[PDB]
């Protein structure tokens, strides 16, 4: 939905309210997102460790 | 060719507007200290103009 | 109709323990303590108490309490009732057809929202009727405004069916709202919880969720409240047509700029808060 980045996508267990699209952590970085087509929650994890 | 006068704008107001607000009132505006009570006259003006 | 047969009693006051917290944005958060600055209802603030009791055994102590109140930077509204007496509000400045105004009301079938130039009456009430030959309740009168012109915004919802029986007992439902007006948007937050109290505002904590943002763009300074009343074979006369009116109460507070600390649960629900300006602790 216009948000760009790089990472690894994985199925998530957290459940969003109907008026929420993505979430942030303490560092204000995006760590979860809802897929526009299949309404499911995915997590984002960095690639370099 | 004769002139189009359908579009209007406001000329006098007591205070400035806040963002994204609208007013469509047509009360008479008073400039002098004499009260108006309607009846446009010497110091009473119709707020809208064309 | 100007509803005669009324007494005159002094107002009543109360406070709000930890009521009035709402979600500040639309972002999901989990296991975090977050600090925000916005318009909030201060803790343990001063709340005015209004009620509508019409006991017929007291020879006229019936009272209705629908006055005009100011609108200073947003209000907090709560209602405790069991017979669906509260119906809506009107917002405006002069309320005399020289300026625009907002109307929200429920008429037992569907809710309507209008930003139109209205000529409001002095006592804008609704009414319900009770028949004896059969056991049923129906609405009969809708006396809110005289005229409507220059009418900009409109919204009517899908129909439903509503119950109008005058239940006896204790209060069952608690309804809370927050109203705000910034940059031409009218913002509403709401939350409904069930209770079993009798005569006071419950103390506790509850977080309010966003409902709608209306693009109305008007000057708002004052507001009233809309109430419904019952009529039956009680010596009619319209202005004093034995109008017994159920039992209900509601509360009003005022918002102010403050700084708060919010606690987000695991599941992104707000469960506690701290008011930074209440006391040094
Ligand atoms: C409650 O209000 C609604 C909204 O005005 C009423 O529904 C409208 O009724 C008029 C008159 O019959 C119709 O012309 C409109 O088309 C209706 N609105 C819609 C969206 O269809 C309704 O009748 C009112 N109910 C009561 C009991 O007063
Ligand atoms: C809003 O209403 C008040 C009360 O009538 C008025 O004094 C004020 O100027 C209005 N706001 C604007 C931007 O005109
Ligand atoms: C109710 O009182 C107001 C007071 O100004 C008056 O103008 C009005 O005529 C009275 N009743 C009605 C609905 O006529
Ligand atoms: C708020 O009201 C409760 C209920 O009586 C009371 O116990 C408490 O002391 C009040 N708090 C303040 C700050 O007035
Ligand atoms: C605040 O509440 C107290 C408690 O009864 C009351 O005496 C006082 O009048 C209230 N403040 C105002 C401005 O009414
Ligand atoms: C009940 O009776 C009233 C008049 O007494 C009538 O208007 C209403 O339609 C009736 N309701 C029914 C039969 O459900
Ligand atoms: C407002 O109403 C008056 C009379 O009803 C009319 O002359 C005027 O054009 C209207 N203005 C708008 C913007 O609808
Ligand atoms: C979140 O919801 C689940 C059920 O979906 C529940 O088991 C869990 O305890 C909740 N966590 C809370 C209340 O923080």
From Swiss-Prot, chain C:
Residues 52-65, 127-149, 158-170, 231-247 are annotated as: Disordered. Changing residue 139 to K: In strain: Kappa/B.1.617.1. Changing residue 11 to S: In strain: Gamma/P.1. Changing residue 131 to Q: In strain: Omicron/XBB.1.5, Omicron/EG.5.1. Disulfide bonds join 116-151. Changing residue 4 to I: In strain: Omicron/BQ.1.1, Omicron/XBB.1.5, Omicron/EG.5.1. Binds to host ACE2. RBD also interacts with the N-linked glycan on 'Asn-90' of ACE2. Cleavage of S generates a polybasic C-terminal sequence on S1 that binds to host Neuropilin-1 (NRP1) and Neuropilin-2 (NRP2) receptors. Interacts with host integrin alpha-5/beta-1 (ITGA5:ITGB1) and with ACE2 in complex with integrin alpha-5/beta-1 (ITGA5:ITGB1). May interact via cytoplasmic c-terminus with M protein. May interact (via N-terminus) with host bilirubin and biliverdin, thereby preventing antibody binding to the SARS-CoV-2 spike NTD via an allosteric mechanism. Attaches the virion to the cell membrane by interacting with host receptor, initiating the infection. The major receptor is host ACE2. When S2/S2' has been cleaved, binding to the receptor triggers direct fusion at the cell membrane. When S2/S2' has not been cleaved, binding to the receptor results in internalization of the virus by endocytosis using host TFRC and GRM2 and leading to fusion of the virion membrane with the host endosomal membrane. Alternatively, may use NRP1/NRP2 and integrin as entry receptors. This is Spike protein S1. It comes from Severe acute respiratory syndrome coronavirus 2. The lineage of its organism: Viruses, Riboviria, Orthornavirae, Pisuviricota, Pisoniviricetes. The chain holds residues 16 to 296 of 1273 of the full protein.
């Amino acid at each position: 939905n216009g948000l760009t980045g790089t990472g690894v996508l994985t199925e998530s267990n957290k459940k969003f309210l109907p008026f929420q699209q993505f979430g942030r952590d303490i560092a204000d970085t995006t760590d979860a997102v809802r897929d526009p087509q299949t309404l499911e929650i995915l997590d984002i994890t960095p690639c370099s460790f | 060719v004769g002139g189009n006068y359908n579009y209007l704008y406001r000329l006098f107001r007591k205070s400035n507007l806040k963002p994204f607000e609208r007013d469509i009132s047509t009360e008479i505006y008073q400039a002098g200290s004499t009260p108006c009570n309607g009846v446009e006259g010497f110091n009473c003006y119709f707020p809208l103009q064309s | 109709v100007n509803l005669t047969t009324r007494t005159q009693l002094p107002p009543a006051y109360t406070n709000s323990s930890t009521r009035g917290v709402y979600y500040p944005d639309k972002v999901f958060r989990s296991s975090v303590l977050h600090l925000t600055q916005d318009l909030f209802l201060p803790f343990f603030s001063n709340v005015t108490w209004f009620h509508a009791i019409h006991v017929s055994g007291t020879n006229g102590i019936k009272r209705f309490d629908n006055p005009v109140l100011p609108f200073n930077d947003g209000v907090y509204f709560a209602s405790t009732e069991k017979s669906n007496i509260i119906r809506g509000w009107i917002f405006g400045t002069t309320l005399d057809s020289k300026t625009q105004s907002l109307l929200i009301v429920n008429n037992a079938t569907n809710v309507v929202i209008k930003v139109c130039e209205f000529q409001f009456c002095n006592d804008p009430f609704l009414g319900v009727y009770y028949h004896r030959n059969n056991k049923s309740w129906m609405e009969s009168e809708f006396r809110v405004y005289s005229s409507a012109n220059n009418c900009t915004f409109e919204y009517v919802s899908q129909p439903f069916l509503m119950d109008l029986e005058g239940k006896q007992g204790n209060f069952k439902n608690l309804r809370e709202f927050v109203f705000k007006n910034i940059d031409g948007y009218f913002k509403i937050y709401s939350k409904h919880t069930p209770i079993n109290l009798v005569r006071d505002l419950p103390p506790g904590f509850s977080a309010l969720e966003p409902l709608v943002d209306l693009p109305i763009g008007i000057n708002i300074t004052r507001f009233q409240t809309l109430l419904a009343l019952h009529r039956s074979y009680l010596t009619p006369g319209d202005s004093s047509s034995g109008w017994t009116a159920g039992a209900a109460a509601y509360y009003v507070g005022y918002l102010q700029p403050r700084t708060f600390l919010l606690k987000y649960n695991e599941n992104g629900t707000i469960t506690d808060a701290v008011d930074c300006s209440l006391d040094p602790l």
